[model samples]
Target: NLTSNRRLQQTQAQVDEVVDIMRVNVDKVLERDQKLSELDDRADALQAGASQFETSAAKLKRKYWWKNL
Candidate 1:
């Protein structure tokens, strides 16, 4: 019975350790996701700015085609 109890305690300890490790891994995943979301947002903003610049440039060229020559 003592041997069995000792084995159970060891197993419990191992489970606790695994739980702690998993918790840390989960936190890291959340942090990585947040960073990725920020990057996606920044990418969207850059794309929008690029599109606006392209539109303005086209309008400017159309109005002043002589400038190109």
Candidate 2:
């Protein structure tokens, strides 16, 4: 009576199975979100740094900004 599925309404084995399934799924979702976030951040940083690099590279070319001087 104590271990019966009908007496307890639900069995311990079924509950444990659902818990394990959900735990594995939640971990995979977290890992995917983290990877997307990291790639987005990298793209933004590269975009901002690229502009500054262009300005500096042009300054090193004497003829680039000294056409009239």
Superposed on all Cα atoms, the candidates' RMSDs to the truth, in angstroms, are 3.2, 5.4
Error of 2 at 51 (Å): 1.7
lDDT tens digits, residue span 1-69, model 2: 555457355566778789999899899889988988998899889988998988788887766557757
lDDT tens digits, residue span 1-69, model 1 = 435588789999999999999999999999999999999999999999999999999989888897666
Best by TM-score: 1
Off by over 4 Å in 1: 56-69
Error of 1 at 12 (Å): 1.0
Whole-model lDDT per candidate: 0.94, 0.82
Stretch of 10 with least lDDT, candidate 1: 1-10
Q: Could you give me the TM-score of model 1 versus the true structure?
A: 0.62
Local error of candidate 2 at residue 57 (angstroms): 1.1
Q: What's the TM-score of every candidate structure?
A: 0.62, 0.46
